């Protein structure tokens, strides 16, 4: 196939162009709602943590696939491992609200706590980049899912439910230094 390149129209040639045959494909695993629905770690927890999804690792599965979109919407699930009770306040709450048990408070069971949180931001969508400020490198302070608090939190996991992504951005792979391709060890049985 030949076409006008500078017009930027999408062109999809087939193997039928020289006698081949396009085969049936199944793309269940690259579905946006499917791939973002797994628990991923948040490796900076405090006694008080504000749930911000831009704190996932930038090279993880969900972390990187979230950096590869401009806007997003999602509910949330969290798995917290804490001592004492765990208080959650929604988006917009004072920081002093986290010391009272009128808010969602979880009395700790043995292994950990697994909750489901809604989307409470005042905006229709959240963003991973922001060109500018919001007061009178840093996103607006209203780009969060709430805050949690315990006497000490050991680990935090998050999961995106009903995820929707908009306006894709670059997504990079590890760079090849001098090789012909990036070679690494792949699992193979012993002996």
């Amino acid at each position: 196939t030949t076409s006008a390149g500078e017009s930027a129209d999408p062109v999809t040639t087939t193997v039928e162009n020289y006698g081949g045959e396009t085969q049936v494909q199944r793309r269940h695993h690259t579905d946006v709602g499917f791939i973002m629905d797994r628990f991923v770690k948040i490796n900076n927890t405090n006694p008080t943590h504000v749930i911000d999804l831009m704190q996932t690792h930038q090279h993880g599965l969900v972390g990187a696939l979230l950096r590869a979109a401009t806007y997003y919407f999602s509910d949330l699930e969290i798995v917290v491992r804490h001592e004492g009770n765990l208080t959650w306040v929604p988006n917009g709450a004072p920081e002093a609200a986290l010391s009272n048990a009128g808010n969602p408070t979880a009395y700790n069971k043995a292994p950990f706590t697994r909750l489901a949180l809604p989307y409470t931001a005042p905006h229709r969508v959240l963003a991973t980049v922001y060109n500018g400020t919001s007061k009178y490198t840093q996103l607006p302070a209203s780009f969060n899912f709430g805050a949690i608090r315990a006497t000490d939190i050991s680990e935090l996991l998050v999961r995106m439910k009903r995820a929707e992504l908009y306006c894709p951005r670059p997504l990079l792979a590890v760079e090849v230094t001098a090789q012909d391709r990036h070679k690494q060890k792949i699992i193979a049985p012993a002996k």
Partner: nanobody, 125 residues
Framework: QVQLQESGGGLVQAGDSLRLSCVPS????????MGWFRQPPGKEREFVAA????????KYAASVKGRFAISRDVAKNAAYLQMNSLKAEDTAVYYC??????????????????WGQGTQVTVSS
């Protein structure tokens, strides 16, 4: 399961500094707590300083609070105990440890799982 590789021991004299390191053999996705135990000559093992893997939550002993400093390298999966302004009492056998099973601050110095053979640090005067 997991074996610990220690580095950086040796001999110094009072007033200098030393740097101990420890890297575990496997890089499993756990929240382990790297710590340092020391055993003085003719005395029993005791806790010095620990650090959590997730955050930089550091515990310390009353003996070494302002002098010693512990850190972790997320990339290289290591931990370093920067010993400063050594005293002649700091002569001991320094051991690292793992403590994989529970990672709460209140218990961060009581029950470790994998030790790894100790290093020798003998400061002179």
């Amino acid at each position: 399961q997991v074996q610990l590789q220690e580095s950086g021991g040796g001999l110094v004299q009072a007033g200098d500094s030393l740097r101990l390191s420890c890297v575990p053999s496997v890089r499993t996705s756990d929240n382990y707590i790297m710590g340092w135990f020391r055993q003085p000559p003719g005395k029993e093992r005791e806790f010095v300083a620990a650090i959590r893997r997730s955050d930089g939550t550091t515990k310390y002993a009353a003996s070494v609070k302002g002098r010693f400093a512990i850190s972790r390298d997320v990339a290289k999966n290591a931990a370093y105990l920067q010993m400063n302004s050594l005293k002649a009492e700091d002569t001991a056998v320094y051991y690292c440890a793992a403590k994989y099973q529970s990672t709460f601050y209140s218990t961060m110095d009581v029950q470790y799982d994998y030790w790894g053979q100790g290093t020798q640090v003998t400061v002179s005067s």
